[PDB]
Design a protein around this ligand. Structure first.
Ligand SMILES: Nc1nc(=O)c2ncn([C@@H]3O[C@H](COP(=O)(O)OP(=O)(O)O[C@H]4O[C@H](CO)[C@@H](O)[C@H](O)[C@H]4O)[C@@H](O)[C@H]3O)c2[nH]1
Ligand SMILES: Nc1nc(=O)c2ncn([C@@H]3O[C@H](COP(=O)(O)OP(=O)(O)O[C@H]4O[C@H](CO)[C@@H](O)[C@H](O)[C@H]4O)[C@@H](O)[C@H]3O)c2[nH]1
Ligand SMILES: Nc1nc(=O)c2ncn([C@@H]3O[C@H](COP(=O)(O)OP(=O)(O)O[C@H]4O[C@H](CO)[C@@H](O)[C@H](O)[C@H]4O)[C@@H](O)[C@H]3O)c2[nH]1
Ligand SMILES: Nc1nc(=O)c2ncn([C@@H]3O[C@H](COP(=O)(O)OP(=O)(O)O[C@H]4O[C@H](CO)[C@@H](O)[C@H](O)[C@H]4O)[C@@H](O)[C@H]3O)c2[nH]1
Lengths: 461, 461, 461, 461
């Protein structure tokens, strides 16, 4: 094709159609103004055509997937094999050969679509865990290409990764890239060690820096660069949006509809067993039982956005959470006044922002998370410097947001102590922490992240 | 002793102490004004003395039970063997010989306490399923006594009753009475048939009437009378209480705290798998899913009062209900506005009455219930003639309250159609039904019930 | 059509084809020698033709059923609604409207096939619980027909039957017959009472006899006869077969292959939660634990023939039984010598007979069973007068086989005492019981049963 | 005290008393001949005295533990917190503060007993995961002591270890030793990294060798040596024992009692979810289903020795295994001939050896195991060079026994292919592998292991 910069991701950046706002596609916008850019991905509808769609600023190359392809490659291998394994086997991975075979077939299809789109010597950026085979496949089809890969989820320790029957094929797949990136040095280091242990490659031995001090894996003639690039958000855009009059009015109205509580705790997560939602509810229930939280003036709002309903583990998790909600309200609420409000539905963006602005305490307690953007979005929204962020150590965000109230979600006693501390912090201490968090998040945004990855990738030429 | 009228029940009519209001003890009040009355029962505290406590109007004979006695006789045999069996094995009965043996021992202890209290030729009224052995034991100790027994729960069909390894001992136990009473002719008829089948006794063959047309079982020289006496409430007292200014004000305030819904559905139950609470929640959820109930102006309040937490079946039921609550609100509620309010705690009497007065639809949907007094209490409270009663056929109350919206709780389609009908009834049709229900309940109260049983018992002399 | 005697049953009497041996079709053989006989049923293959197949002695009228029809009418309504309900809700019935609707449609299809086959004034005999609507449907299409119906499973008490949302349609369905038969007087009496209670029909009030003293239900102009006819086997044929040299040799070989135990206990059941297989295993395990059975010279063989694998309750039951087997052998067996041998597969007829002949104790312990033919087959096989039958009271067979060791399967203590008694009986006592059981079974065979039902049906003309 | 060499372990080396044969205490025997040796541990009985017991060759210092101490320190913290966590969270660890507190208290008690026994400047060797706090505690009480610690179970990756709320206290605890040893370089390397990440200590960065190329952690003034020392058995003793006439006769008799199969597969494990017993049964069942194993001449014997019955996870595992056994025999066995023989009981040593000698295929398929001595015992027993070892990669043994048939137990397809390969290997190929395995195991025995650890520990002086 005629594209000199190509993004490859599981989905096209569109909504059933119009171009989806925010996210990655928006971060790459000023680069697409200087490159002939293409995006390869599944359009979210089964058995579509693979004819290029030109969005003026971007050419879209759709990948044809059947509903069966999605079930086995995505719902199956990606979400029920790789996802639990890479997140410290919080649930038991399912190892299924038919899923693996479809994962391979689908990955090859993405590689072929990429080759179609990519001009000679083009730069290719492959995204995330569903497409780990693409770099090697693409290099085999197109050795002229410069290929980066970024993993948006954690890379597990070798002891767990080795369970995968197709461990070598996945590792070889990633090693097809010129640059392999992770959010954290820890992931990068796991990858280097895996390369020595499983593949027998020569690697660098030093610690991996942040956006610097890169690792290397020697693969025959070529070197694979390995780095840590912690993703972020468009901090300035969110900061601006959260100041809008209508947002502030909605935040006030939200507190009124809750019966004007003195304190609001907020959870916002795509529903997932990685997110530690059960831990928040348990801590909140025990604090109420112990009379350490006032059931008359404190309320917890949990917004869970629907996710992967076709995967049994997620249905079971939804059942457990919903029981806890029912239980806590039955024990500590009053008719007309729950202590927990729980919604299981997508939330409009401006509604989400209003909740961030209304919340006195943001509860972000994942058991394991690659980064977690919600923690950073909350911070970017609190230009009033109010609020408090309670944040699990087991998120990538915790490496940057050390001024938050950090918790080990497995240490329930300390999660409880910490929620009480956040609820009762002095105004001045709250401001001190929020000012420091905002300096970090405003300076380290999605633009810095993308530039850093692309600079590293360009240097491999 | 010196008491010529003696009530025997699992518990003394007191609260940890003061005499408990309402109920049986209040219905017998004008009889105790003419008799030397006694009450035998456990005082609700472990390992107490058995020394008589004179309440001027009544002498209380406490029965000493250890916490272990309560666990095996009551929590065990009564609540985990007899209770599920007599209620159509909604949950699997547990047959345990140690429980049976303690049930026997405890029953003998009640029989001994009774004999102590009862004067020569005295009238004795034994209450309910925990004390089914007492009549035979008492007749053996004291053949001079006139003994009635009333079962407050259903008497199961013979096919189920026969499962009980101690079926003959229980049947013989009841046959020790001069009069055996049930709420319904159906129970009485089951008992007659059981007497022929299991014991080989000669019995009457005709249908058993209501408070009349009694059955008989011939036991050697003596005849056991068998009858149906449907319990009720103090209708006039509740009717009066519900008109109080403070109650009406609270009912208005309740609707305001719910965000002034157009329609309130109400469930009030001691928590129990017999009560069909899960069925109401399922019906309500499906109606919301189908858009047949308006999620913006209709709300369901379920008040579940704690019961038998030491019994695993009840903990599991509580878990299922609480999941449904969480689920329904997550799907159809809004932050600040649940469609289901659920409380798991005792409710003050005047608060309960305010809820009856506030509720547009009373949901009483047991899978199986001896009578269900809540259905009658709601009716007695609605002197404004507003409201609507949705009532399971599988309650004793359904035999008297035919003007209610009757449902087969297993017929979920019809339960749903019926809830929509009740919510949308014309004012005039609602009044017609409520007027008819009140005529029944006001005329057939707990005083008529008690008089009828005691007249029948006196006639056995 | 031109058939003056027509049998209607869920399946044709054939095997995927050849005419299936034994059973009903063999009992009717000398009647088909005098009548133009027809058989209506599903041929066991999906979407077949409905063209008559003449077997010289019989005309076969196949009913076309799709795999979906079978799933909803049979696997669904028959096996997951009616079956658990009629067997004292050992598992929870599922009430599903789509299943009911297919059950109706399929029943009408059987009725139409019947009408096609049946000559004017013909006698029709409809079999069993899958076809309860057929008599009324058939009478509506063909008021000239004489119609009998026999239920091969128990008829539940009214308290349970009333759960069925389509209770009235089923009752009306059965009332379409001239004669409704059950194995036991108890079923007949339940039906009479149901007729009064649900339908408001006038019925007889006396006890129902065995093959005599029939009940009646008055339905407008016509009377429905109600009777008890306990099914049996071809006792003489089995008695003869069990004496064959090859059978006796196999029985000896079976004992040798088991390591020549002193005592063999045997269970033979179509796998079903009604059969009380779990109870036998529990009793056997506790006896071994208590050292009351000798683990060195006593062995239990359980033959479970596969049944209804598409129904979840049966898969769960299979899992529980298989755990008990594994557990008991792990605890009390030796390598090379299990104390329990368990097979889950169909057994050839002559192999089954050899096991009957080898077994010292036959364990037939259903929680609830219409008759249970295995109990009678064992007896018919023991012309040597050896062996012992342990038999649940909750089978129809227990009403005729009172000389067996009868047990309440819920009374585990007594089941255990009884198994020890059977294992250790004197030769003379064993013979006394087996002689008496054989007199009953040899005199009361399937020929007496069929004649009695057909005589009763003929008398309705 | 007066002991210059002291072993500290959870239990004394005795049996309820007499000195237990084999194991560690036997390996140290020629060292105790030159040192004043002591052993500190719990005597296995609750609330005993702590008075020294002199065994002439050894002084025993008993530690007083109550049954409650054992429940919280051992059954609780050791077996339900540490054990699952260190074994790649195959089951979910339970984090309980009361368990942690008892673990601390008990560890301090072991430290005090040690100090009592240990002479000035004595050498102390602390054993295993129940006693990880002892080295730091002991160094604080007795800075004169030389302290080694060896972990017999895996040391998990940092991502999992970090879950532990008391992660720092455990790490500091181990860092109290002069020498910290693991079976594998991988564990040692995890420990070094943990030291940098959690404690901020300076460590060596190179790979850790086997019994050489040691790692180091700098802790203030002192250096902690870190090493890999793979445990083994008394290879020569077992080799000798397995040649005994009575053992060989028993092995022949075992095959006869199994009905002289052509092939015997054997599993021998302390029952534990780490052991992958479920995987063997699944593979065996699928091979039978596929007809790839002959159900007529191949038999699988699984010997599971009882373990940790008070821990719920182990009861659930026992239930799953026992179901699989029952299921497989019901499907593929015959009466008198199971395809799986399963025993849940301790086996005498000489019986175990006879089974090793009888087995054509040894199935050692743990999901995760520190070493696994059963794999090495089998090899040492096969001086006839017959047999075949199927061995999980996820055992420490797999690093030394590469000539075995290695499998990824999560790769069920390959486990199945491998079992077929082992069952059908040529005699010559079997001998080649067994000869090579025996050279390794005979040369690398428990004496080499103990000498190597003690030499490393002595060098820290
Ligand atoms: N408009 C709107 N309505 C909702 O209802 C709504 N609900 C949520 N959101 C927004 O979605 C995003 C969720 O961000 P995550 O951090 O949870 O990312 P993941 O989905 O888990 O996916 C991976 O990739 C990320 C980036 O690399 C990593 O952080 C993760 O660790 C990694 O798992 C946030 O921005 C949030 O605000 C909504 N947005
Ligand atoms: N004050 C107050 N606070 C509460 O929270 C509160 N919560 C409930 N209640 C009152 O308790 C009574 C419950 O009546 P039930 O009908 O449910 O009776 P059971 O407890 O099930 O016991 C048996 O005996 C009865 C009589 O024979 C039969 O009807 C039953 O079928 C039979 O099972 C009602 O009156 C109700 O209003 C409260 N009252
Ligand atoms: N050849 C062969 N191989 C096997 O593997 C094999 N396995 C079993 N059998 C034979 O099947 C028959 C099972 O008889 P049931 O009594 O259990 O009858 P159900 O199947 O439950 O069906 C209903 O109808 C019966 C008659 O009215 C009632 O007794 C029942 O109560 C009622 O539920 C016996 O004859 C037995 O020997 C095999 N026969
Ligand atoms: N006599 C007798 N009767 C039995 O019934 C009987 N049943 C088993 N055994 C013997 O017990 C020993 C079990 O050895 P393991 O390797 O399984 O060790 P663990 O118990 O899991 O404990 C840890 O420490 C070991 C050494 O560091 C590591 O290998 C382990 O990875 C690690 O978990 C073997 O020797 C075996 O033969 C019996 N012995």
């Amino acid at each position: 094709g005629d594209s000199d910069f190509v993004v490859v991701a599981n989905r096209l950046p569109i909504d059933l159609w119009k171009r989806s706002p925010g996210g990655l596609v928006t971060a790459l916008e000023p680069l697409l103004r200087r490159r002939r850019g293409a995006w390869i991905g599944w359009p979210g509808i089964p058995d579509s055509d693979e004819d290029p769609i030109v969005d003026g600023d971007l050419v879209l190359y759709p990948v044809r997937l059947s509903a069966d392809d999605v079930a086995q490659y995505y719902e199956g291998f990606s979400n029920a094999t790789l996802w639990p394994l890479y997140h410290d086997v919080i649930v038991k991975p399912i190892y299924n050969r038919q899923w693996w075979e479809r994962y391979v077939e689908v990955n090859r299809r993405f590689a072929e679509a990429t080759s179609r789109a990519a001009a000679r010597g083009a730069t290719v950026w492959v995204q995330d865990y569903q497409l780990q085979l693409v770099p090697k496949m693409l290099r085999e089809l197109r050795p002229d290409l410069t290929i980066g890969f970024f993993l948006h989820i954690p890379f597990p320790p070798v002891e767990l990764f080795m369970q995968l029957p197709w461990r070598t094929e996945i590792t070889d797949g990633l090693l097809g890239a010129d640059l392999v990136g992770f959010h954290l040095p820890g992931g990068a280091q796991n990858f280097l060690f895996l390369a020595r242990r499983l593949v027998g490659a020569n690697t660098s031995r030093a610690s991996v820096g942040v956006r610097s001090k890169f690792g290397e894996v020697q693969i025959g003639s070529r070197t694979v660069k390995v780095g840590a690039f912690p993703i972020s958000i468009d901090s300035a855009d969110l900061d601006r949006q959260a100041r809008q009059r209508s947002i502030r009015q909605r935040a006030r109205q939200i507190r009124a509809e809750l019966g004007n509580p003195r304190r609001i705790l907020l959870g916002v997560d795509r529903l997932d067993y990685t997110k530690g939602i059960d831990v928040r509810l348990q801590a909140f229930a025990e604090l109420l039982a112990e009379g350490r939280v006032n059931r008359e003036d404190t309320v917890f709002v949990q917004l869970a956005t629907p996710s992967r309903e076709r995967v049994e583990a997620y249905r079971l998790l939804r059942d457990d959470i919903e029981r806890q909600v029912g239980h806590i309200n039955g024990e500590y609420g009053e008719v007309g006044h729950p202590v927990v409000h729980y919604l299981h539905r997508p939330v409009p963006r401006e509604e989400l922002i209003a909740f961030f602005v209304a919340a006195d305490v943001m509860l972000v307690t994942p058991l394991r998370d690659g980064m977690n953007l919600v923690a950073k979005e909350y911070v970017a929204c609190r230009s009033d410097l109010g609020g408090a962020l309670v944040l699990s150590e087991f998120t990538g965000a915790a490496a940057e947001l050390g001024q938050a109230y950090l918790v080990n979600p497995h240490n329930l006693d300390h999660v409880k102590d910490t929620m009480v501390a956040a609820l009762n912090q002095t105004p001045e201490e709250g401001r001190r922490r929020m000012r420091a968090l905002r300096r970090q998040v405003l300076a380290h945004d999605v633009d810095l992240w993308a530039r850093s990855f692309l600079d590293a990738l360009a240097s491999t030429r």
